[PDB]
Amino acid sequence: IKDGLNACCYICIFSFTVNKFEVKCLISLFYNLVGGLDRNAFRNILHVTFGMTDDMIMDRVFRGFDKDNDGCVSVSEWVYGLSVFLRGTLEEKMKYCFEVFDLNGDGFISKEEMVHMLKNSLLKQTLKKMDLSFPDYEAAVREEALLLEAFGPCLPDPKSQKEFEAQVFKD
Template structure:
């Protein structure tokens, strides 16, 4: 057993080890979203993902039901934890996750347009922000909206590769 594995068995993942894992095993690169994923896994807010938090988090991350994934994505996107995804939060996440295109026009304008489109499509009670109910209804109507504000779930390929590496059967020939 490597030193990092024995350290994990004793205490859990600290933030840096966790973020390295997200990057290495799941190809995540967005610092804001990776930090939010860490906060979502770290249920007791002790800046360490314990074995129990890791297993519970992974079960949603890799194999969660649509309902579990909606709750998880909402928590990731609610940057300040106030129960809403605000226009400012959407702007910040989209600005981070969209590729920077060299162009004459102000990229912030395009992002503001995307935020307006997202609100028009998802803000069912028209209060200018997304509650959990708004987000849930929008995603249930159109599953592609689950990761509307940036990739915070692994793609199928990296999920399967992770599961294969982690749970591969030892077969006797």
């Protein structure tokens, strides 16, 4: 295939938790989206398809997928993060959520990425068991699965994501 060679090389390089035809059609819909994805692609598709109306989290998940900071997000990291969202391990989820919810990227979870997103979490009118470091953060997250996304939303919400993967991964 003139475009499936990308997916073949990507299963050769990256160990996606999705299998052959799944990643073929995933990259096919990526190429449908690009007509390779910029900012506006994220701010539209993760708002309409996914949800999570917090625009700071939109930019933050954009940069977390854009860990290489090329602006035009590459298909390699795009499909890698999408495979993470589809089928990811607990360690992969905690690594991704930690480095994303660290907004400035200081390697930890300081005041500007605890209190600001706590008030993002509070519709205006935790560290007791964690402490912020990744080891004890991981300890309290594997204790309470509520704590996995206790700084930002992320999603993998089943009724959202299993329906979306139902239209994506058309057999």
